[PDB]
Amino acid sequence: STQREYVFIPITNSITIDVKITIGGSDHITNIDERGIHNVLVITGYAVDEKNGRLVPTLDPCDYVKGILVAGTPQQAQSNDFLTLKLPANKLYLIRKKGNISDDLKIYIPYSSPDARNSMKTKPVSISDDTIVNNIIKEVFDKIYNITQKEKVKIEKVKEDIKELFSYYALEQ
Amino acid sequence: STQREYVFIPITNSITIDVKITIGGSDHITNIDERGIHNVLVITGYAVDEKNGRLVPTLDPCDYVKGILVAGTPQQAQSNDFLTLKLPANKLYLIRKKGNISDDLKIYIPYSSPDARNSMKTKPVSISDDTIVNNIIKEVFDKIYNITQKEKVKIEKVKEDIKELFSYYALEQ
Amino acid sequence: STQREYVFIPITNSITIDVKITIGGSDHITNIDERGIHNVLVITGYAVDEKNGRLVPTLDPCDYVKGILVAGTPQQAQSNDFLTLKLPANKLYLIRKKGNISDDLKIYIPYSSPDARNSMKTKPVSISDDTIVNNIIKEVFDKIYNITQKEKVKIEKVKEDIKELFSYYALEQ
Amino acid sequence: LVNAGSGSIVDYVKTVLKCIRENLNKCSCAEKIYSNEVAKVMFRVNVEKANVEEEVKNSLEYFETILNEGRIIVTPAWHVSISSALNRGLLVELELVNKHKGFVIYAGGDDLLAMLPVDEVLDFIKESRRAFAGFGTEKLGNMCLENGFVRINNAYYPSLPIVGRSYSVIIAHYADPLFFVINDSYNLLEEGKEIIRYRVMYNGEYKDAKKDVAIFRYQGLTSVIPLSLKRPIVSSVSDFNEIASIIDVILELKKRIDEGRISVSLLYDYEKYKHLIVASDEKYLTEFLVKDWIKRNSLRKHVEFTIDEKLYGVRLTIENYPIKIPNDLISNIVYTLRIIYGGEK
Amino acid sequence: LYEEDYKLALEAFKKVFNALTHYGAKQAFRSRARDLVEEIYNSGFIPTFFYIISKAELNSDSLDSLISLFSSDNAILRGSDENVSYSAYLFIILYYLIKRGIIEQKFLIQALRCEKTRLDLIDKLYNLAPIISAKIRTYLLAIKRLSEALIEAR
């Protein structure tokens, strides 16, 4: 029952906070100790909506929405904005997994309504453009420790896993 | 044949030039005629300390610090810090060889005495921050190469060809 | 630390030991426990000198000098013609490696200071006169390790220990 | 070689290619790389008879032949992979010719022959060229295009991102003899694509490439629109979004014309602005001459149409051939529109 | 024939464009590039040349700032916004007669200093009036186009 959170990694300037105070502990998933970003999380079958920086589900098992599971607090306010599920840690789509963690979790996933006032489309997109990696990793994730960018000797390595791992599917609306 | 000294390029300013009496000729085995510095010699073990590091020989073939070979005397003709051995110049580690040589020449390679009292784990360094790459040409190249680079047009790519082929290990002791 | 002294296998008359009273303890790294000789520390860019034959500095990269490394100090009274170095035991360059230790190694290889007036010549020398090693097999692991010649059976694998392996270079001086 | 085979192995081969460059060690490199291997073989006690002095030699013998021959040593797997990818690229190529209301005449592997309407021809080339390189937008069939990796249900398959792909568009009357229209298409490209050079950006320099050109032809008018402008066509995942980047420059331009946002006189006035845009070598000055040439013969007051600014100076040449190509890219963009618009009246 | 005149028009303009510090002087030059080119071919070359020099207000440090502009790139034109503009266009015309060898550069540079010789310059241009007007056309027309494009309102 780890009160987990999922801050995903698009190019949008809309993933600023969307969250609040810490896990309730320090058993995190930013396993950047060895060689950079480890233990990625990819939702299957979701959009990113290119705006209103939450996630929208679309029912084809073809989409990838990626981002690191850094826990915390869902703005201390939301209950319906998330799926409120309980995973046993063995039913996910993960990348760069370490020694198996056989515990169980709490689930808050940033959710936008399907709300197909428009039509839903999938738009492939990734990260490039040094300023487009300069913005977001300094917004939030560098502050997970802030000992990163302090002594982090893998700055050249962590900077790439934004353009190497997290490739999401936009909305095209 | 005649005098030959080895000019090893440091990052420090400790053993700067110290080059007395000439050859009678000027047959330095380096030749920078048109666009590239040639006959750059690399050798195993001799690693620099970046502070008066005169390339003590290590035993690992990974450790190396290159240099330039010219027709000089043992840094002002003293019996302090040189090897003074000879090999017939057919079993050399010469990158970008050029032209002809002298077969059995009096070579002079600088030598530092063993540095005890510390462990090293020496690190390889690729040099940048160009402010150095011209300092090694202000007085220690336009004197040791006192024929070339003022009669032709090309002057600039040597400070970058000393970037592509120059890289070596730092003692840090 | 674990001060280490080094032996080698020439075809000279300055072979057997050149070193006196042993470890004084119960430790060594050049293990001959299972299936022949092991951990024969290799050293390149050096020679045999074949003439009061300690090591020789040779810029030739095509040199394969190698021998048995033992602990202790080389006669404790010769502070003239050795190398007096230290390495962290992973910065080394071994052969047929064995168990890993992250200590530091005070290596003591015999290496004279010729300051040659004649050019160092190079000569290929592999293993000849299979009887010649019968002297030195009792001068390597039956000199200081001295477990051999009692009830061992690998004296046939001790043959193939040198039947093919040792191929170093000489001077022809 | 260094980028292939990543992991703990790369730093081993990184040193093997080091000790080659100017006719180097000649097997006297083990010293640098034996340490790499022998200090590694003890990570597991199973070494049977690994003669490390030979192992690093055979590897050094391998890369030697590669660099001496200047070409990858071809194995069956090298073929079967290129061959299978060539069949998967065929699949996505057929959805594109159907998406653009075209008629496939044959499409086997790398080749393709189709009959498109004059309308969907420009954006077909745009998507087809990028889809060939693996990059692409929304899935076509049951397969997506992921930056040089066609993906079929979580299964990633390689594509051919580096391989250039030339195009040849004949805008022909429906009554023209199909014998001479097909002949021209094989004697407009296959001997016209063989002679066309443009100024490509190669490793900071400006070299002269000759392939991947997308020739257009309309009864005498000819146009050539390079699709790469960078000689290793893809060297990083950021190289994809500018493949066929000149096509949408023509597509956007064509879009703003039929909406009356730009007069068609744009194509007829460029001649006088051309000599200045040619002779001008300061890009801050050309980005104002085309901004002026656009707004002069524009039909509104809120059309802000840019040109990517890497298109200033291409100088497409041709060696003594009965094909007259304007020797600059922006002029070829104007001729391409005249050809597309000539085949709609 | 005049393929290198679109080149010349780019170096001459970039000189005038920089020796026009004040913004209202650039705008005033843009007004000269449009208008002066259309009187040379309706009213004639020297009738427009007389009009240019009369409004240029020579005989100052300006007349020597021109001499510097022929070679230097740090020169500046100071004076009335209507003066720097008209004098900057006199440079444009003279810069062409130099680079094309219609008028000897040494003559023109010393005729721009010696007061007694300026009348001989105007006397030389009178006989070269038909030849000049033919050649400068492509050059001046290009200067007109560069002005309308590069000289913008803030």
From TrEMBL, chains A, B, C:
UniProt-listed Pfam families: Cmr7A
Family matches, as InterPro entries: Cmr7A (IPR043959), CRISPR_Cmr7_comp (IPR053743)
GO biological process, one term: CRISPR-cas system
Gene3D superfamilies membership: 2.60.120.1670
Protein name: CRISPR-associated protein Cmrx
From TrEMBL, chain D:
Superkingdom classification of source: Archaea
Stretches assigned to the Cas10/Cmr2 second palm domain: 73-193
The protein's name in its UniProt record: CRISPR-associated protein, Cmr2 family
Cystine residue pairs: 19-29
Binding site for Mn(2+) 5: 190
Signal peptide coordinates: none
From TrEMBL, chain E:
Keyword entries, A-Z: Antiviral defense, Cytoplasm
Top-level taxon of the source organism: Archaea
Annotated localization: Cytoplasm
Predominant subcellular localization, coarse grouping: cytoplasm
GO cellular component: cytoplasm
Family from the record: Belongs to the CRISPR system Cmr5 family.
Name of the protein in question: CRISPR type III-B/RAMP module-associated protein Cmr5
Species of the source: Saccharolobus islandicus (strain REY15A)
